[PDB]
């Protein structure tokens, strides 16, 4: 029994975000939560994933490595969230 | 009525880390995110609760956010002059 | 019997706009009309208030003074509008 | 049919001052605002009415707006080639 | 029997786009398809027209000439599209 | 299942030229446009179909777009790891 976790890769543009998502779901047993468009200078897209801490750490590292060859990665981060309400922290539209 | 706390960051990733850090105490409620945009790609995380709880939560959120991204604003309104529903903007989640 | 008036404080970001709103409703007997997000480089939020010319002049001066300690104030303005249709001039979504 | 007048400003505050100034004559009708964004945070105020009324209103709107903010564009289309509803964009208020 | 065509004039701001549209519909027997707001630094508005290749070439040249006296024209382009499904290529919201 | 192709441009005009060029072969399907914004005014054209068809279409789209505007990104995902519906964002047309 592990701890749940939230993983993010924030890129300039959608193309790099789709490559980060595909790379993330391919590298670990992580579930793709969804994309979040924030736009504003750079046109930022955030790819969010969930799963075991180790899986999410490996997936975000993989997704960022992939996305960097397509576009610019602005942020890469892992939140090891609790057991219950792992997506309570996310924004409503996902 | 209740105190209002805000952390405004450049990007969503830093805003989600600020939110997780802020809700980490049982007496602080996540009101929601508000996307503004501009050069930063500004996201505002709003919380409510007791003055002390909100002061500690926003200080925690900003501390966390900063290690992920850039914090543009951090503020606490201990006694909002109108009902927190009146003072806040229409779309908030 | 006075003249009705419209007051605005336009800031970079929402946090400074919420502080301007709270400061405005605290300083004078002015009603908070609402916020308007315009985004685009700076991420501009406009706080609109209504009431007596004097009240609105005092409130916008107060709101701008407050908002400047939280963020950047881009514009501060008072329109002394007519008796009838004081919000006819505003944009629909408020 | 009727003439079309536009004042495009950097920001909403300057656009509201332009609109108030433009509608200040009984023969000029406020079509609406259109938010565009970009580096300016562009807002377009559109009016309609008689050529003379619209020429005087847009010149008044731009004169006013300029003292509040930056005016990016001012223009009058005296005889729009299609119906004003056809020439304008779908969402206008 | 000619070939159908799609014409575009992309400007910084709406005012220049409305002048480009009015100029386009005045210069040739072209139908105004609609506007597309893309925003992001410059606040780009695209005016799309359809009709005969020659008509669309003359209209876009006219619309761009007009729009340049009101604002900044970012792009001017003509696509001579097929006979069937001339608007299949366009984005849904127009 | 099917390969996924993307061309991301600064502006819509270059994106429409990329799309027209990409669909110019019967075995390539236009998924849709996605507007992102930022300094570029980014528009992403997404296509699907056979690997070879998608490789040739995105190379064609980028070749075309570039003569109209600026191409920010060009990429092909030959074997998307989840269903193409899962990997793509919710609003796509």
């Amino acid at each position: 029994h592990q701890q749940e976790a939230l993983g993010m890769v924030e890129t300039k543009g959608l193309t790099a975000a789709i490559e980060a998502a595909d790379a993330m779901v391919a590298s670990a047993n992580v579930m793709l939560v969804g994309y979040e468009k924030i736009g504003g200078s750079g046109g930022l897209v955030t790819v969010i994933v969930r799963g075991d801490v180790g899986a999410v750490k490996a997936a975000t590292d993989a997704g960022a490595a992939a996305a960097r060859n397509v576009g610019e990665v602005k942020a890469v981060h892992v939140i090891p969230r609790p057991h219950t309400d792992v997506e309570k922290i996310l924004p409503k539209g996902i």
Side-chain angles (χ1 to χ4, degrees), chain A residues 5-11 13-15:
Chain A
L6 223 59
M8 294 134 293
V9 168
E10 184 156 57
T11 58
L14 184 69
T15 301

Side-chain angles (χ1 to χ4, degrees), chain A residues 3 5-11 13-35 38-71 73 75-84:
Chain A
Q3 194 192 346
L6 223 59
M8 294 134 293
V9 168
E10 184 156 57
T11 58
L14 184 69
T15 301
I18 312 186
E19 185 49 55
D22 174 75
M24 284 187 275
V25 310
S27 286
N29 204 89
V30 301
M31 184 206 165
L32 177 74
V33 174
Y35 297 96
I38 320 92
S41 301
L44 303 170
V45 185
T46 308
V47 204
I48 304 146
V49 293
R50 70 170 293 177
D52 32 332
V53 192
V56 166
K57 273 188 200 150
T60 71
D61 294 353
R68 273 184 195 101
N69 293 303
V70 175
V73 177
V76 201
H77 191 66
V78 175
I79 301 165
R81 262 213 68 87
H83 178 234
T84 45

